[PDB]
Ligand binder design. Structure first.
Ligand SMILES: *[C@@](O)(CO)[C@H](C[C@@H]1CCNC1=O)NC(=O)[C@H](CC(C)C)NC(=O)c1cc2c(OC)cccc2[nH]1
Ligand SMILES: *[C@@](O)(CO)[C@H](C[C@@H]1CCNC1=O)NC(=O)[C@H](CC(C)C)NC(=O)c1cc2c(OC)cccc2[nH]1
Lengths: 301, 292
């Protein structure tokens, strides 16, 4: 019935976005219950263990907190730094607060970005947390505080809040608890990123999506097979993660192998052979944007 | 930062979605002011011109309409057919109605899809109206009533309402005026799909996206150049639309060529050499995320 990069509706996140201004720094934040969560560097660009002293002397009323979607100006009563985030307790309780959970995202999974500016989500796109704990997104100045999220069943799952943009078009941040993804920090210094490794489960997923939609026999789908052990011994020297990266993803890769009648050993052997050739499918594989769940949930069984 | 497929936030669309049920037919609908819009086949699977009689005898009271996001059940006072859409005038006015407009989409133009079910938007994805007036979308049963939209400055532009899933994984429907995109109708029967043709503007923007994302000199890039006139001849026999398909896109295409320092004649020449769904890029969306 069609296989697309699906995203989660942003209406629930939209009504909770607020703009936060302190001194000359401005960014975004989410207003849950009577608390506003925003990047802690909205009060200044510090480093190390000097954050605890600035939050202790943080002028509560110096925070300009506006919810543009509800037209309310909020008043910060107390400031509590939790990790790399600020929990600003306001007097007003957000009526638009949904059922929510603070859930950490595993590398290789997908989430939806509510890219906001001045407290208003302007764009919405889909990223995948990579093995180097980074995402390849689109963020300009004033996008700090934009949240990555997913929806399950009338409950909103918050996983991300934007902080830093690395020059290789990669981005990093914390969860809604204040813990950075990877060893990166919210400091303007030299930060080395871990070696990029392919999330094999998503490379296999992106291959099955072509086999479901290309309809024509791909000239890159090899006629041989390679086993999981032979692949994992090869993956250690070819920048590929251990397959399977997630046992739950196998249940989807297994349904994809039966609905396409192409065994997973055919895809792994192709991945080994397709290292020499294609990545983008431009005219005449190898990507982590398709997840095994998103492909299987859209495939006819 | 990077170049991504940008979609529009569905918050305004969500608060207006409602569920429309008539007999054993359940689908979605959008609620603007005191009028509800929904596909007419909710009252039955008809064909041709009997719609006028079937709607004139369809009671404004067998319609079950609810807005789940607002938890409000709505009653229909009057029913009117406008094209392939139904106009159900309800008693309550939607307080969550933004400044909206019924703008028709042109071939090659991108739009954000709000895949809804029982009045609740479940998934959001991005499509481009193809030259055969088709969209490669993702809809299951009950997704009828879903809308395709864009946003420009606090104003919502509604372009599409899903009706039909074809054999090939392509979908079709009408605008918000009730007129189908292409020569298709809301009938369960094999329909002739117009011959496919590549939107050269969006294909050109596809190649320009890689030059800004990756290196300045990929392998597939051709070192020679072909003219717009010479390409247009080859396009008439190779299923490529006449370039430029939209003169407005040349503002972005020329800005992308100077930004990437590779002319549009090389891109067109590469497309000829490259000959011997997915993430479709429009020239505006690529140029907007490009620096300077
Ligand atoms: C926020 O909007 C600030 O409120 C901003 C978002 C980035 C700006 C441009 N595109 C974005 O995504 N965040 C920052 O500017 C942060 C500030 C930190 C948390 C103190 N810094 C970066 O994103 C950043 C800094 C540097 C750098 O320096 C030195 C060198 C290389 C990369 C880099 N990224
Ligand atoms: C709506 O939800 C109905 O309210 C439904 C959406 C499709 C269902 C599966 N995936 C979808 O996108 N629409 C239909 O089922 C329509 C109903 C029409 C407008 C009366 N029917 C089709 O889209 C359809 C029917 C047939 C067919 O018959 C016979 C033969 C071949 C293709 C085909 N498409």
């Amino acid at each position: 019935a069609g296989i697309k990069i699906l995203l989660h509706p942003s209406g629930v996140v939209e009504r909770c976005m607020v703009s936060v201004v302190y001194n000359g720094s401005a960014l975004n934040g989410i207003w849950l219950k009577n608390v506003v969560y925003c990047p802690r560097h909205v009060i200044g660009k510090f480093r190390g263990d000097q954050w605890t002293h600035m939050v202790s002397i943080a002028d509560c009323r110096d925070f300009i907190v506006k919810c543009p979607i509800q037209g309310i100006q909020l008043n910060v009563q107390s400031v509590k730094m939790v990790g790399a985030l600020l929990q600003l307790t306001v007097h007003t309780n957000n009526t638009a607060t949904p059922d929510y959970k603070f859930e950490r995202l595993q590398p290789g999974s997908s989430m939806t970005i509510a890219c906001a500016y001045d407290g208003i989500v302007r764009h919405v796109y889909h990223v995948v947390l990579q093995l180097n704990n980074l995402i390849y997104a689109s963020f300009l100045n004033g996008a700090c505080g934009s949240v990555g999220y997913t929806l399950k069943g009338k409950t909103l799952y918050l996983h991300y809040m934007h902080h830093i943009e690395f020059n290789n078009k990669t981005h990093s941040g914390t969860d809604l608890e204040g813990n950075f993804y990877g060893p990166y920090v919210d400091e303007e210094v030299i930060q080395q990123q871990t070696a990029f490794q392919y999330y094999t489960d998503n490379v296999v997923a992106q291959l099955y999506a072509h086999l479901l939609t290309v309809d024509a026999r791909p000239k890159w789908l090899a006629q041989s097979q390679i086993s999981i052990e032979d692949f994992n011994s090869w993956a250690a020297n070819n920048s590929f993660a251990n397959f399977p990266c997630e046992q739950t993803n196998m249940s989807y890769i297994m349904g994809l192998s039966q609905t396409a009648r192409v065994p997973v050993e055919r895809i792994l052997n192709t991945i080994i052979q397709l290292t020499t050739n294609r990545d983008g499918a431009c005219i005449m594989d190898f990507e982590c944007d398709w997840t095994p769940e998103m492909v299987y949930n859209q495939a006819p069984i």
